[PDB]
RNA sequence: AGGACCGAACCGACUAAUGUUGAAAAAUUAGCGGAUGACUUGUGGCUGGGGGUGAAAGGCCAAUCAAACCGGGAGAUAGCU
RNA sequence: GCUCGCCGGAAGACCAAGGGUUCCUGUCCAACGUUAAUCGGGGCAGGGUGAGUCGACCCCUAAGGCGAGGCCGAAAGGCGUAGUCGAUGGGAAACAGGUUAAUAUUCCUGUACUUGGUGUUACUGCGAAGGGGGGACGGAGAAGGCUAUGUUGGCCGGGCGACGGUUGUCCCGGUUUAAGCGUGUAGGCUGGUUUUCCAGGCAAAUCCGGAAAAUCAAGGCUGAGGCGUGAUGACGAGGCACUACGGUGCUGAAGCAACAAAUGCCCUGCUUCCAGGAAAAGCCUCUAAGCAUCAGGUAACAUCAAAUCGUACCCCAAACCGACACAGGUGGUCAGGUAGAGAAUACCAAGGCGCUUGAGAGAACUCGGGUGAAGGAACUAGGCAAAAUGGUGCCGUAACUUCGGGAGAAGGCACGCUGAUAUGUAGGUGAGGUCCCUCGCGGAUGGAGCUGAAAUCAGUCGAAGAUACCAGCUGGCUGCAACUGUUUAUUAAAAACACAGCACUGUGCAAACACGAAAGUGGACGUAUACGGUGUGACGCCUGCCCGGUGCCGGAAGGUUAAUU
RNA sequence: AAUUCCUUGUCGGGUAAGUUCCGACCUGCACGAAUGGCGUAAUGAUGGCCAGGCUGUCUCCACCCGAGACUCAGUGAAAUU
RNA sequence: CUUUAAUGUUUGAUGUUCUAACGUUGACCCGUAAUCCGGGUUGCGGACAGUGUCUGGUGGGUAGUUUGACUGGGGCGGUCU
């Protein structure tokens, strides 16, 4: 739910929280936990490869099952849980055989509801079926791109994919980015939209909030002496050159897609 | 409840005087700021020189930084002293 | 040796790190000590560090490192699998007292305990590089229940006062006692027991998980403290003989209660919040492959073993880092008394010091401070500095405002001591006693004693009652930046850098991008409500005209145009 | 105007007297709308200005307490030449 | 030997399709009590992609260098036969 904190302090006038009581107010399922130590934007060589990353709050990894290959065995939702490693919330489900697993939580899922995977599953939100058996004009999430590896698209808070057509062993999709992609007509997809849609209306409010997320401050570059950045310096605020990345790339329109390996599944890239 | 309030430890270093072959190759005294947090601290670890890191000052990288230090090319070259 | 003065959340005591004999004793004084030196952290010699329980080694791992093969790479070599190292973390066990010139939870006395090996006996399904469980973990807040400890009283011993008073509501001191064993409370959590079935846990499983029934509601786990035991002991103020006044054997009284009470224990708890909170082993269970009048397991007793290294001393400092016996720097632990909100401040206790040149004189001038006639910022670049303000409670409190603030706005009154209300109140604590009982560390009743505010009235001293130390100057107009923050270690803390927010743009995942000759890694065990880059910089009303130029994104008819031919 | 050369712009405010400050005027040498424009409560060891209190800051110094200076003893440097 | 159409042959351009090269940071099995690697099976792509040699364009991202002299100081201007 949406709620705006009160201006009891400078640092709360603009903070906005996304609260939800349905989430489990307790410890998570340990057997599905894994240590996730932070890196800091560095690599095996120790060099900062991705800037603006460091610190943040400790996190343990919740092993999520994006494949959903347990077919013909229904599961009941035990409880909704909070996962820091992603924006959407997850759901601990209990299979009839006694095995529990985590999944992404669709829009209107609850605790106690049932879901089933496979080719003979029902057409309801939260179910997983190969897109071959999904009608056209439907809406799915956690879409696979190659059969067997697991969902890779529409995994975020409120991201959904819409199926537009089915030509052969392929199907055409419009992703949340407006792009029009095609994938094999056997890649499993999960019905419904990921439910955290109020995650975008959130407001951190203060700088320290972004630092809890493991984010580090962003220094522009215009105040970065010429040795450090192309924009560099100058007496005052000159900036009389083209906007450019560090390492010299435009950043203001220049397209940088150079795959040329797929180059078949793209139809309506965007805009 | 709070990057909330006063204020010690703790962390800093705004003003002044002293000191300036100093007690000290940046301190002392008197006041000053933050003080549940983008806080602070111990231990150990990673990043190596046209590179690192940098809430960015051309700042820091062993009292040394507009390209560290040791050795070597090297008895560089010096129409200048 | 008698005094004086200083620290006393240390300038005291115990450690890590680091140093490595500076420790103790004897002896010496050239040099070292900023002076002398009989002294010394100096020289010389001798002596000193005693562990099954402390720590390390050892078992388990974190970040990370190395890395058989392997992948990649002109060579060197780089990345990395299985694995192996790696604490700053997890993992069995000792307390008190006494003792040496110098060591001790290490020696001695007493009382305990833990993990293993072997053997006898009795009863036996044992077994893993595997499965599960557990270990296992955040921040803040909230009390309650205890203790450490302290105060008073009582008890015991001593004392009757260098000057008035002092046999009394007088004065001084002591009033300590552990681990462990046993008891299982305050209290926290969880519903238990039995039978059957099952796509799960890489196969199996009596374990875990899941489903279905009957049957009982009481079963259990965890748990500070207290009590008892340990303890007819030990220690003990002080005695009595030795007594070189350097010191020894024996003896040694009381050894209770109440109140207050922690930041520490119950508490790895409870409650609540988002930023959602290590791993692995030991340990508890499950069985497989396997072994069965075996081997092995369990239980009791018995016996043996528990090695090796460190252990002195300093450790906010003269012993470590600073070239010095240097106003510096240095992590953790113990945290008394009076007043106080307090770990501030003042004065003190234990204890430890007076800072390794002194003596005198009492000029200018300098430094650090104290007071000041009248005037009161006339000083000065500038109220620089200094002076001033300063506490609790009550009344009261502006424009403006994002309605939270502004605000401790401003400003005003009252603060002592004594007595009474009340021979010490309200409150808090709570014994005996009575009653109850599942007879217990119980519940109720009961209120002794202890403890003790705050206010009112009255009276009273002083120039002055927040009397010391401690301890906001205030207000008004205004620029810039929203704010908290960050920065030029060592002349610049700012209007700069960050910032939440906004926008443009790129990126469909083997993502863009970045580090890399490459492999590969990061981004991310993420997937456009995401990530990267750029600029702007809370919020609020808004963000206008121009695509010629440069760049970017697109597009076509033609022209020009590389290697090649 | 953190931007205004001319310039102490002009008027008014405040002062006995105000190149600074405040508020208006516009002739903006050379503001201007996310290298953002105009406002903005709160905040700030921020810049500037005016008041009350306060004072040895000053008129104008005076006296006093201590540490040095001075003298004796012991030890015993330095820049410079 | 001036000339043009169905075939054979030839190479060259486009188009559709296939799989055997190649790719696979898809699935499963084994080495193997191993998310590396390799092998195998299968699927998806598929002669594209990608790499090598050559070549055009772009290229302060990174380098090595240049940027004169006279001169009533230098610069500016002017001059240099």
Residues A6 and A102 both lie in one domain: yes
Final residue of a structural domain among A113, A128, A147:
A113
Q: A217 is in which domain, residue-wise?
A: 195-271
Nucleotides of B under 7 A from a protein CB: 1-4, 37-39, 46-48, 52-58, 66-67
Residues A6 and A101 both lie in one domain: yes
Nucleotides of E under 7 A from a protein CB: 25-28, 43-46, 49-50, 59-61
Interatomic distance A105 CA / C169 C1' (Å): 81
Q: How was this structure determined?
A: cryo-EM
**Cα distance from N-terminal residue to C-terminal residue, chain A:** 32
From the Cβ of A137, is strand D under 7 Å away? Answer: no
Interatomic distance A243 CA / C354 C1' (Å): 71
Resolution (A): 2.8
Final residue of a structural domain among A79, A113, A147:
A113
């Amino acid at each position: 739910a949406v709620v705006k904190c009160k201006p009891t302090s400078p640092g709360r006038r603009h903070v906005v929280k996304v609260v939800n009581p349905e989430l489990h107010k307790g410890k998570p399922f340990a057997p599905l936990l894994e240590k996730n130590s932070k890196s800091g934007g560095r690599n095996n060589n120790g060099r900062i490869t991705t800037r603006h990353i460091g610190g943040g709050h400790k996190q343990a990894y919740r092993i999520v099952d994006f494949k959903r290959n347990k077919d013909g065995i229904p599961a009941v939702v035990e409880r909704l849980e909070y996962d820091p490693n992603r924006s959407a919330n997850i759901a601990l489900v209990l299979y009839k055989d006694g095995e529990r697993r985590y999944i992404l939580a669709p829009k209107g899922l609850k605790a106690g509801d049932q879901i089933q995977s496979g080719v003979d599953a029902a057409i309801k939100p939260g179910n997983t079926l190969p897109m071959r058996n999904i009608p056209v004009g439907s809406t799915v999430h956690n879409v696979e791109m190659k059969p067997g590896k697991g969902g890779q698209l529409a995994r975020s808070a409120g991201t959904y994919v819409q199926i537009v057509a089915r030509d052969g062993a392929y199907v055409t999709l419009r992703l949340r980015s407006g792009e029009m992609r095609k994938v094999e007509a056997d890649c499993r997809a999960t019905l419904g939209e990921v439910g955290n849609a109020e995650h975008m209306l959130r407001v951190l409010g203060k700088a320290g909030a972004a630092r809890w997320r493991g984010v580090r401050p962003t220094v522009r570059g215009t105040a970065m002496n010429p040795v450090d950045h192309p924009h560099g310096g100058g007496e005052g605020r000159n900036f009389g050159k083209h906007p450019v990345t560090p390492w010299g790339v435009q950043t203001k329109g220049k397209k940088t897609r150079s795959n040329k390996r797929t180059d078949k599944f793209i139809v309506r890239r965007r805009s």
